[PDB]
Amino acid sequence: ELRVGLEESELWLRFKELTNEMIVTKNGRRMFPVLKVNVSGLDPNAMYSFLLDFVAADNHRWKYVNGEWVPGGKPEPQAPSCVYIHPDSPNFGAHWMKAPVSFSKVKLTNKLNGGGQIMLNSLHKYEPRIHIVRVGDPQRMITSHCFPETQFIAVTAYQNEEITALKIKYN
Numbered sequence: 166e167l168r169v170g171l172e173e174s175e176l177w178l179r180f181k182e183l184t185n186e187m188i189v190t191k192n193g194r195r196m197f198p199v200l201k202v203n204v205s206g207l208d209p210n211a212m213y214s215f216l217l218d219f220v221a222a223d224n225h226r227w228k229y230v231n232g233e234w235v236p237g238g239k240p241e242p243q244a245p246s247c248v249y250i251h252p253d254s255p256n257f258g259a260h261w262m263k264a265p266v267s268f269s270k271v272k273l274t275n276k277l278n279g280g281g282q283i284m285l286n287s288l289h290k291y292e293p294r295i296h297i298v299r300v301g302d303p304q305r306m307i308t309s310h311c312f313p314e315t316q317f318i319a320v321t322a323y324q325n326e327e328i329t330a331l332k333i334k335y336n
């Protein structure tokens with residue numbers, strides 16, 4: 166049976182209980198923590214690509230008020246559908262399953278300034294989602310996993326000083 170498990174779930178949860186924040190910049194910022202998953206029950210002989218996108222979690226934006234995240238207005242029009250191809254794509258099931266799959270090079274941006282970056286809206290909540298794409302398949306079979314532990318708000322700067330501190334502590 167295909168299983169995709171979140172690595173360092175305990176670490177993600179320490180950020181999620183504060184409300185997680187990720188920085189977006191003109192030139193794109195790598196994530197901390199890094200999304201890493203373990204994979205079982207692929208066909209070790211088949212070839213697959215791994216894709217990552219970010220699903221808008223709400224029909225409103227957020228604001229940090231009196232040390233609390235609160236609904237902060239109506240949303241902006243949704244960010245363009247940005248998909249990151251894991252640089253090991255395409256590869257054998259055996260490759261994907263032998264060691265955790267790390268998305269360490271993906272960059273979050275608030276400008277469509279190219280470079281395979283993911284465009285997000287500041288002060289909007291996103292949930293990372295991994296797709297597994299079987300190569301050479303006439304049915305173009307895809308599997309999608311969502312990682313609710315990894316929810317965060319895109320920010321141009323940290324709002325919660327505890328998040329700022331957590332990021333320095335564990336990174």
Ligand SMILES: C[C@@H](CO)N(C)c1ncccc1F
Nearest residue numbers: 173174175176177179335336
């Ligand atoms: C929560 C911590 C242990 O305090 N832990 C599970 C960690 N896991 C991965 C990277 C860094 C970590 F520190």
